[PDB]
Amino acid sequence: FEQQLIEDESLLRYQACADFWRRHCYPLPREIAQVVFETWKGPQALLRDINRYLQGEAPVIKAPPPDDETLASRHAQIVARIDTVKQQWRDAVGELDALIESSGIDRRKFNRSNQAKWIDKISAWAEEETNSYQLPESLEKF
Amino acid sequence: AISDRRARQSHPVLEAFISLLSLPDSRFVSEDVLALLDVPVLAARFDITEEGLRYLRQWVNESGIRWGIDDDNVRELELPATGQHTWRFGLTRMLLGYAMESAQGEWQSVLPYDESSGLIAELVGHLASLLMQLNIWRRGLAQERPLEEWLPVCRDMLNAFFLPDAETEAAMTLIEQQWQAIIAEGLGAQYGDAVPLSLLRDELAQRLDQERISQRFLAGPVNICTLMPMRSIPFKVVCLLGMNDGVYPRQLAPLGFDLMSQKPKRGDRSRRDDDRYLFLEALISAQQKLYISYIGRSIQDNSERFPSVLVQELIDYIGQSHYLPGDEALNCDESEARVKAHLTCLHTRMPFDPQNYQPGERQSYAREWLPAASQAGKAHSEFVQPLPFTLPETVPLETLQRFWAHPVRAFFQMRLQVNFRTEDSEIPDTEPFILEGLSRYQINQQLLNALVEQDDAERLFRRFRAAGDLPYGAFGEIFWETQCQEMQQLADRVIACRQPGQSMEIDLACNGVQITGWLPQVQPDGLLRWRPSLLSVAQGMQLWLEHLVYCASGGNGESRLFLRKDGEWRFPPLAAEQALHYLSQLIEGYREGMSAPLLVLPESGGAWLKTCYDAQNDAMLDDDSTLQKARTKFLQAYEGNMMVRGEGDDIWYQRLWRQLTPETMEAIVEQSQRFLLPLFRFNQ
Amino acid sequence: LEAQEMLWLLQAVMTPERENTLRSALATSMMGLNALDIETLNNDEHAWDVVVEEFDGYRQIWRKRGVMPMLRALMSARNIAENLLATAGGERRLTDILHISELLQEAGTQLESEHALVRWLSQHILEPDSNASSQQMRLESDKHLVQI
Amino acid sequence: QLSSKAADLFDQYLVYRPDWLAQWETGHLVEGLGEAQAWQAPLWKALVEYTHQLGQPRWHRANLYQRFIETLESATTCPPGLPSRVFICGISALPPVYLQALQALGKHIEIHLLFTNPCRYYWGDIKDPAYLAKLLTRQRRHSFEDRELPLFRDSENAGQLFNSDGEQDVGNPLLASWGKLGRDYIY
Amino acid sequence: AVEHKQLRPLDVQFALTVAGDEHPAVTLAAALLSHDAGEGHVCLPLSRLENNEASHPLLATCVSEIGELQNWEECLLASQAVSRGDEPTPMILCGDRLYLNRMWCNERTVARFFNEVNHAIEVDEALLAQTLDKLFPVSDEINWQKVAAAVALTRRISVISGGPGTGKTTTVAKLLAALIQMADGERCRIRLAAPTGKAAARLTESLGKALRQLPLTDEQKKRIPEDASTLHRLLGAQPGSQRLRHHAGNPLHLDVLVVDEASMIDLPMMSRLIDALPDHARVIFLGDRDQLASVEAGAVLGDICAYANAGFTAERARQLSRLTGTHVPAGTGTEAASLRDSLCLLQKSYRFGSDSGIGQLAAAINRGDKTAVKTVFQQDFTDIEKRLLQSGEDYIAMLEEALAGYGRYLDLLQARAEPDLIIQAFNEYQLLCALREGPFGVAGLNERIEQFMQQKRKIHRHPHSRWYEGRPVMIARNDSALGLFNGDIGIALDRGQGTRVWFAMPDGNIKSVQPSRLPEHETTWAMTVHKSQGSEFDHAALILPSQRTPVVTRELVYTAVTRARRRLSLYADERILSAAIATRTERRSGLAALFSS
Amino acid sequence: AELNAKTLQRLPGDNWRVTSYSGLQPTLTPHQFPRGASPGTFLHSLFEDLDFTQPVDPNWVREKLELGGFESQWEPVLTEWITAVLQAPLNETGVSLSQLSARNKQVEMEFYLPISEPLIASQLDTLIRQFDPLSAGCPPLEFMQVRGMLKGFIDLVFRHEGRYYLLAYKSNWLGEDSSAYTQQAMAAAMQAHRYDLQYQLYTLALHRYLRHRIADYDYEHHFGGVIYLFLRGVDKEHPQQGIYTTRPNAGLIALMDEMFAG
């Protein structure tokens, strides 16, 4: 019958975002928290991203993740996806059978050397740009 | 005399008791506890004075106390136990600082707090006496109790948290009276089930603000009161305020399930009919003069605000029942509109308007705004005035450094002794997730001073983590790793050309002026300074002054300063004659800056000069493109963007001028060309 | 800047014994004094005694009658409103001073202590949050201006 | 909150509508009311049983006014303790229950009612033409002049002023628009 | 003690936080250590913790180990809060005495500064003897001022112990004159330090009136010490932070540093002064040995000058006999030759001799109470009077004697004379009370004197003005802009331009300030003995409370006796005066053991 | 153009204010009762609510101490003290409070007294000192010219054998614990707290009330005196201690009525 209307809702929204960042970003290990820091510096950037969706009607996300997938399962999936490409590069290394084009310079073996030092550990998240040189759609056009 | 107002007797007693009734629901933020300690009753209960509160302000601000009274309170809210940034963490830190110096190190991953060391830390023993009590009732008011158990709760809270005084006796008596009346009205029905705390808290908060005062209704002063029904008293002058639409008549919607509103009878009473009868009784009860004022124009957007329907019907009956003798037979609607416009006095928006003081029908009685409305006053003269100043014999180097760090500030805070003291920053509400500003600069300075001796960076990491200044967990490690990478990249350039040098004395006699001072870390290679800052003109001016005061008495060698991002200020060694000439020029600039305010902006003037200067030919360019790019650099460095604070946003420059005129801009340009020219002339 | 000047004036009224706050508040643009006037005020002890006496009277009015009577007595004795109306571009500053005075009087009735209103003013200076009542109004309506 | 709102509605029923509570005490509904009575009639009666279950007294304001009227109309001698004269000044709104009690109080003890009306003529409503003739037969008299003065401005044309439902066409629009409470009180 | 049983909440929270889940023996030890640190004791001996605790067997039944933890040292070292000096622990146990880490660090710093750094500066003895002969005219017998100046110019760190009225500032002036006359070509940046601003002003005016008397040169007048600074101002203390400007890195660029009134220097201020000194500065400490203790926890000057009673060394006695040219006695035994050589004791007081009862009472204060009773008893020396204060009639007699003491002040007040003579008459009679509130205190005696001036026709007072003519005020905070310090008296009167407060500057002039310009003001009809240090009064009257309090002790009565110039009155019981002399304010510290080895 | 402001010629209003008298100015014992304003109002409400004819019930005193919030141990000593108050007669003939019926008593009579002349303190204090013997000392108070109404709340008015009497309650009495509250100490308290003006205004109000109500009224025939009842001064063995009975000279009342009337 009696209720109190509030004019500003940003304080409780920032408090709930800080509580979410406390209950989600604190117990992460180093290999996940590195990627979390690379995505956002803190909860303020996440709130600045999702402030247009937190207010009003909640939108429907196209192709949502499953309810049982956590951050660690996605991290292990991407780590295995990177490790498969690293294994396929380590197996098929030491050969060159493609034709040398006028656009393709002969320094590409140095880029293969840049791909030789890349496969050390799977603790990182960002691959090398020289893999863009190893695309069949870009090598066919060259 | 104002009557019918809400009875407000003691706000800081009733509001503090209401906040103490919301003790388990509170988050125990540091500001809410310093607000509870702001009450003199709660401070006098635990033997805390005002000076003790002023010490506790900075103690809570620097000890890293943000929220959470205990670790069990953090675990109650379904949050992970961080162990830091709590009241218990700050209490342990202050007690370890009372026991152990800060230079010893951590004990239980808690760095001691070196401020509270003497007997003043006894006040800490008062604060730990408070929060523990704030624990006990936090465990007391959570459980639900029946009405037979809520009797001594408010009395025990009053004798525990509050102290009886002469002024606050009636407030505690009213609290006890209302609490016992609520419990007596509850137990009169013999309520057997449990009653929660929030219901009694809301009932006490509603009953405490219900009281009204009407003692001075007819004391003899002019009466200020609301419209009260069934009260019509004849008066000579009756004035009415707030007769606009929406406010009056006061509409109270029915409950909807009331049966009296469905089938009305004769004896039924409604608030709308009561307000209409009040307006009728106010019209009848007026004997001599009736004054009616309503808000017609909005103060925000200048929107037309229509009056109430009663005043509109009154002015309609006035216009349809009376006519002016000026237009005896013109029309019916036009004479009505002329009467309604003659009665309507549209007053001015501001009290200092000259329309109100024009002689005629209405004239203002405010004599304080009469010379303000006459526009016969003198304007604000300029603050710059030629003052007499004699240059003393012995002028130290520290005075010249404080002058050439900021000349307008040295003219303000040293000549006329005017230092604009701004209030300190408030305590933030959350733990620091990022590092930026002064804390990041102090961390980088200590890390650069640690890495210049090849010390253990992990020990300084544990020292900064034990104080809570770093983010929790992995993010603090990432921040410390990137700051250690940046400081190691800077130290690889710093200690590449470092030699052990001692501090030497400076005693110079130039133009009959004695300069006494000391230069620290004077190596045989020259001058070596390092700071974790950006490339700025103020540090270049400081290094140029040190190079002039170093080369004038021996010291053949370069002067080098290393900033971040491969920034370097270098000055070659000069002869004694040029150094003494430039030192005499700086002394003449200092004695000109003490008499008149020397308008030499370092940053914007240096940007204008380095845009106009050419170091290859040692001459200034005069083409239109450089003259436009120098104006662009001056407007960029004076007023910055929305992310970087500009040089013009300062309390020392806004006092002289409010808007940057082009005449003062050209004066600053000329002064920077006169003074800041050897900065970029000998730069390499 | 007018809110900071009013904060300095209230700090000089609350604590008129220490000459540093009074000297920092007298040299503001609201009073409008030259550097020669400040130098002669620092040199003459009797004029500073008169200033301390009138600021103690302002503190007595502020403790007995409230905020707006003290501000009106300060604006009438110093005659700063006529000087701000005579200065070109000072009418907006005067309307901002009047709105800050109205907001301080609206916030002073809900507070019992005198330093609590100064802390509230310093907090609202430190809090740039925009409310419907605490926004800047139109400075003038009679003079036609280009409306962006 | 529901208990407080229902207690306020029950207090308004105790003040204004005693017949509804008297019929709810038996258990019978009233024809022509709203739907909320379907939960309001059993809620009141179980209240009357509950105070009948405890040691609290039974008597309230609604069931007492009829016995108070009857014990004053049926009595022969005046009861002791009553005051000599009661003044009612500044009161322009009373329920019909209070006026029916004050009529039986005034049959014994002289009660002076000082009522402020802005119009001197009759400006209320009417019930029936048999009540219109009863109002026409009633005439006021001055306190000092002691002369009989009629109520309406025209006695022969008094029937043409009232409508078919019983509302008088007031010539002054302000009195007709603002004084509905006084219009009911003078009736 | 009585106060030691009533535990402060600070000590209880310290014991609950530091010990926590450990044994209750560690909790009781931490509580006793925090209470002794709050009372002012530096160290805590384990014998008092073992013997004077009833729960010592109970905690002996609480611990359960292989060796059962019978010793207190093993029970403390088993916990993580007490170590032997290696781990960063709050509590430190080294010499069977438990202290905190800060107190142990400051005590070891003071012991290092007074045991190792104090070396012997070897200078020319012939020129020093010639300057001592040309400065001191008395050369017939042993003069302690000449030996003090010789041992201060000889060694680097020297402590001059002497009471008030012994001519200490004349000795300092002769020392500075011989210092400048010894090093002619060498520049000397002499610096002066004081704990309080009022003592700094007194030191400045005393050295100003002393150094202009001695004949100097044009280069010698250039090396006159300019001003005396506070110890918080010399080191550069900030209001917000405790960071000093000359903390550890850059020392103060000084040649000689004379620190006056070292009795008011606590242990943390002494340790902060020690860390700021370079490896070549020579420090000369001034103060009295039997004076009142320091403000905070610690006793530096008393524990330093406790070894002055032993005497000098056998070689140092011959050195002083060769320097001064007189017969200097030698001290028996050798425990610490550096500290015993650096000390000196002043016993010959010049402003009062054996004929005056003030010096005899001060000598009998350090002895037993029966010696003081005999000193007051026989003939009173026409200097000390004893008035018994038991009931209300004795209180009325005390107020009548205070009226007789303030008679010249009221006579100059009612006659409308110049305020300088009014302040000079007010500065002759002064009451000294122990407490602050109650019937025996500052505000009690002040309100009773104001009511008595309202009763008898001596002072007219308006009830709503609060600024009546003739009220004495005192300042509580320092103010260098107005020229008044903490502990300075002012008299409010009407010169004709209004009610203004006149203050007596040490320069000899009078300053008329507005009462609205005063930052703090408290009525000073009766001053406390702690707040009256540094000042001097011609006729003092001590008032002691009947309630037993630890404030009234031997040093308090000694400072009340030495506060009077000529005349002293007493208002106390015989049992309180007998108990205050025997109960000496001892402060347990590790300096007695560290200086002995 | 030139513009000016109108100026008010005179003062806006005279000193018109409706004020009151305060505006013109072993282990359990009644001596050990806490002295304050709230305990004074609690004892005043206890003496107001209690009936004088009926004996005092201990459970009612316990309920009143529960409602007030005082200690429960004081209740059995307080009720017998109340009976010690009720057993002590307060009259010149020895009339107790139990002989007063409900129709004879009237508690907390509120009166409004008009005055149309400017009340000069010098013309009033001399008129008081001309007849009142207690005005030998007591230098006169200073107050502004008060024209208008005066409020007052008399504690009790009661008639007996055809004679009207007034009774007021004063219960602070902090400075007395022994039997020193004699007539001299009560007269000194009346001279210090200046209750003589209050009692004179009470006599004037009662005279005007008995003149307006009762036809054929005489001041000497109907009025008997004013009784002040100090609660902490009432003893069982001393009937005179605690009460203070005063009768005016019957000539001050007419001159005060002529002064207040006009």
Coordinates of C-alpha atoms in Angstrom, one line a residue, chain B residues 169 180 219-220 354 357 363-365 370, chain F residues 3-6 16-18 38 66-67:
Chain B
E169 CA 16.6 13.2 28.2
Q180 CA 5.9 1.0 25.6
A219 CA 0.1 34.5 19.7
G220 CA 0.1 37.9 18.0
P354 CA 14.5 47.2 -12.0
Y357 CA 11.4 49.3 -8.2
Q363 CA 6.9 48.9 -5.5
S364 CA 9.4 46.8 -3.7
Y365 CA 10.4 47.5 -0.1
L370 CA 17.9 49.4 -4.6
Chain F
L3 CA 14.0 54.3 -9.5
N4 CA 13.4 54.4 -5.7
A5 CA 12.1 52.3 -2.9
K6 CA 9.3 53.2 -0.5
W16 CA 1.8 41.7 21.6
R17 CA 2.4 38.1 22.9
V18 CA 0.3 35.5 24.8
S38 CA 10.9 14.6 34.3
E66 CA 6.1 0.5 35.0
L67 CA 4.5 3.1 32.8

